[PDB]
């Protein structure tokens, strides 16, 4: 089994202060709702990606499904800000989060899993139909469902997701229904 | 065992639906409640059911009967809980000094 | 009135040791008890704190005396 990435959240400093009204009026697919939130929400189409551009020149880019695709979408957002007229430098690009999900191909019985690992797992059925297991060494949060689908979130690199899944796989096989 | 694991599954997964208690409380207030009220009020009522059934199985174990719960063990369950003040009635103005 | 807690309450009695197949009359007694408890708590909550509004704070003051119920409310709110 391999976990495929579904969501990459990155951040990039453009270095130049922006007034948001000209970007909202000139650029396409740009949404600005200040009485609601203080950023410009511009979406692109080729890579299905969304950017929140802030007035201090910092940009949050989310939605892509690899590191190179997120970097390429961030470059596209920087050049569409640039060609409007602002002098925009690609100062620092950092990926805040990487999210991956996988299916372990059997039903899982969560009550023994909270019974034997109650130090790291918080499980309350009523609200969330899932078990939050916190891995202490990778620093990942895993939502483990009864149907067999596991969601790994809270990672910076890919190898952390891979090591967390290889860590939590023998426990899940030990607790098969 | 194989029944204790099924019983522990029903002890945790069972709940009153939030779509009906929010309909039930709002018929008493008149206007509106919040989601964190319905989350708590659906949780206290599961403890209160577990206050009765765990004590109605003490009535049945005290008498000479089996696990199926007749209403004899359930009217006696509300009687013993009310004598310890567990069942609140806001229509009986009580008086301790006589 | 119909029964709004007929199938849900049968899972809960099995959760506390009754049977897989409880009696309909026992399920009916439990449903009536739950409705009465919810109504009493809602009236006291409307009286205490903000008049005419039932809030989590009012519910917590009302359940403060009973340890089992207070612990469950706190745990559910923190987990949420």
């Amino acid at each position: 089994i391999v976990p495929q990435l579904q969501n990459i959240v990155s951040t990039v400093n453009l270095g130049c202060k922006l007034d948001l009204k000209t970007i909202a009026l000139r650029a396409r697919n740009a949404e600005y709702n200040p009485k609601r939130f203080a950023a410009v929400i511009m979406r692109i189409r080729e890579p299905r990606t969304t950017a929140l551009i802030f007035s201090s020149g910092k940009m949050v880019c989310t939605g892509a499904k690899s590191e190179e695709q997120s970097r390429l979408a961030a470059r596209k957002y920087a050049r569409v800000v640039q060609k409007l007229g602002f002098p925009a430098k690609f100062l620092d690009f950092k990926i805040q989060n990487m999210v991956g999900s996988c299916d372990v191909k059997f039903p899982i019985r969560l009550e023994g899993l909270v019974l034997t690992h109650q130090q790291f797992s918080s499980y309350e059925p009523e609200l969330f139909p899932g078990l939050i297991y916190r891995m202490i060494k990778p620093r990942i949060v895993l939502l483990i469902f009864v149907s067999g689908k596991v969601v790994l979130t809270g990672a910076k690199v890919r190898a952390e997701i891979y090591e967390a899944f290889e860590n939590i796989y023998p426990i899940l096989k030990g607790f098969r229904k | 065992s194989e029944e204790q694991l099924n019983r522990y599954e029903m002890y945790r997964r069972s709940a009153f639906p939030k779509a009906a208690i929010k309909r039930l409380i709002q018929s008493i207030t008149g206007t509106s409640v919040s989601q964190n009220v319905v989350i708590a009020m659906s949780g206290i009522s599961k403890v209160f059911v577990g206050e009765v059934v765990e004590e109605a199985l003490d009535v049945c174990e005290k008498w000479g009967e089996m696990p199926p719960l007749q209403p004899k063990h359930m009217r006696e369950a509300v009687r013993r809980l009310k004598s310890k003040g567990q069942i609140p009635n806001s229509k009986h103005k009580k008086i301790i000094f006589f | 009135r119909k029964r709004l807690f007929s199938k849900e309450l049968r899972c809960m009695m099995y959760g506390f040791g009754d049977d897989q197949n409880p009696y309909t009359e026992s399920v009916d007694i439990l449903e009536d008890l739950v409705i009465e408890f919810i109504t009493e708590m809602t009236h006291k909550a409307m009286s205490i704190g903000r008049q005419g509004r039932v809030q989590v704070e009012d519910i917590v003051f009302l359940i403060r005396k009973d340890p089992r119920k207070f612990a469950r409310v706190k745990d559910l709110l923190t987990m949420n």
Partner: peptide
Amino acid sequence: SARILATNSELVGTLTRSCK
């Protein structure tokens, strides 16, 4: 969310009883 409750109608309460 509805799969935690769908199994709560297949296992428990198969036959309906009554009592005198």
